[model samples]
Target: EVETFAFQAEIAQLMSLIINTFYSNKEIFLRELISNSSDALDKIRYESLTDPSKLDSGKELHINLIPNKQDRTLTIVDTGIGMTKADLINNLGTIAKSGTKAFMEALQAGADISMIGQFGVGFYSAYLVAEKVTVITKHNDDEQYAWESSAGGSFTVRTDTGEPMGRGTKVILHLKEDQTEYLEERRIKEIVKKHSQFIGYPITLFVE
Candidate 1:
């Protein structure tokens, strides 16, 4: 069964705009993505409070950052709700959710803009600087899957290898040459604190 959906055309266009402009600094990508992860943890935590079983898998709600200078890759892993094959494609390729026309209508009419970010566009920010992104995810409701993309126009999803995260998602960012500053410990920490300091979950870093 499909685990996620996509945004509408307007949403996709909006996402493309966000990637190209809203975030003037390259480092803003890390901040936005990490904040989105923290928001996910918060969502699960809140849901668990109402349905105890939702907390059965794990209560360790935090985000992890693994930077590999060798491969020139930066991995951001979170133990949150995972996506399925359809989700991998639709969410990454085209928009999958509500009608884009309606969304734009609301926005143009002065609707609260914050709702858009909370809705889905948050994750797309990764493509702003990454040459490629690999998502390794395990959902409590389905088998684990690996999603890969380059923001070109398509994506590939397949069964994941190795041990899954028990529950959650992992995003591995293969950074472009000019985006290498994120790999530095000091720079990453600064970005994390400046943006995710108030997040409800712990944000851990894996150092070499």
Candidate 2:
């Protein structure tokens, strides 16, 4: 069954802030997303340290960037600690006041890269270049689920029974017409190198 939910009021405000103003640079969208995936990878690796079974995906720990020009979509897939339905909503639907306050202040003046995740708004930066975003995530203790939104006040999530995504998250960004440059291999490679060079896991890009 598909369920729809409105974004939290604070999230609505944060989203508007991200979508309305150019965040000093538009390409930081890629940096924010890749950084998030890197964090997810670190989570699984950290959990597996105490409980080896936490590495339930049976997939290598890495990030994969696939640009489908045919569909005009850019996908960032990560093998890490995936999310359950509740986790998806909690993590993505709402924002903490303390964190958001800092993010808002930072946004009004100038954004500090390190301030990105403090408010958990990093994921929403996808809207900088995307018209819509589809997030498919699977957690070891839960089934696969797809969370979708079109930069509106609400989002939708439904159980997925198609091909399995193992235990990780896959984010598909339907690029806006003006943002197709992000779909280029050369551009994406440059952004990754410039921003996420020190990430522990490989951020693989599919060429052609």
Candidate 3:
């Protein structure tokens, strides 16, 4: 059985700031998401190259977007390295151990993305345009798990009994009323190509 987890106090405040200020433009959300997918794809590709057997999992590195305007939902799927339950908590819940302190010090010292993900705050960028978000991830070494949260400082995790997509993760964004533009196909395409054209993987946008 899978267990759920919640965000730590300082981490919770960080989530709030991320949603409120970290993103200056809603369009940047697409870029951030794609950037994350690209990283995952790169990691898996590197792993597979080192050990060809990794390709036997039959997962292609792809980024897919599906929008449901009626429900105001935008789902981003990626065939890349997925996280397990512990990863959900550690990656999403806690601060990067010494990350907050280092980022704060960086501001004092005038440093930046030169070491951003090292602080592990990249994933929370999803909260920028979403009221609530859900993540379904299947790791190569563990059973799939589903994680859900409203960025309201609390998150829940559970066993994802649904059919796994072999390997990778999908994030479903429940867009707030003001964030409807993300559901646009043309907008997503431009954003992907502009921000992620150099990514070493295929990214697809599915609109309906």
Candidate 4:
């Protein structure tokens, strides 16, 4: 079954802020996303500690970046804790933990924007460079699904009958006209080395 939902009023406002004002560094989008992936991997590893079976027996904890020049798309995939349908709605539909209020406060206070991921809206930063964003994810307890948006006020979630991901999350960004630099292997590798070289997991660039 497919579902569609509108972002909360506050989320729409925060999206505007993030796209128009929040980040001066467009490349930070990759950094925040890698950080989020690390967090997800950390979470599953922690859960596996209490119950060894909680971890998928075959999947490794790693991140892969695939840039498609022909399609002008960049994908980040992680074999980490994937999200459920409800998790998609809650995590992507609304800003969790009063992030909007804190985000607004920081801007009003003229605080340093260097702490880009301080708020939970880091994922939305994809819109800074993408015309459309799609997330394909599968969790051990849930079926594979896709969540998509154009940074508009609403997004859609539906069962993904496409290729199976086993158990992980894949985020695809359809680059904008001005953001084609992100599609270059050199550029992406530079960004990863600069901002995410120290990430706990191995980050590999898959060239096709």
TM-score of each: 0.76, 0.91, 0.84, 0.92
**What does candidate 1 score in Cα RMSD to the true structure?**
4.6
lDDT values for all models: 0.70, 0.83, 0.74, 0.83
Tell me the tens digit of each residue's lDDT in model 3 across 131-170: 9988899877777889888867678888888876788888
Candidates sorted on TM-score, descending: 4, 2, 3, 1
Model 3 vs truth, CA RMSD: 3.0
Q: Which ten residues in a row have the lowest lDDT in candidate 3?
A: 111-120
lDDT by residue (tens digit), candidate 1, 45-148: 77888887876778788899999998999998887766655556554435534434455566679764334444455566676678788888876667788876
Segments of candidate 1 deviating more than 4 angstroms: 1-24, 89-119
Flag the better candidate by lDDT, 1 or 4. Answer: 4
TM-score of 1: 0.76
Winning model by TM-score: 4
Alpha-carbon RMSD, candidate 4: 1.9
Candidate 2: where is the Cα deviation over 4 Å? 91-98, 109-115
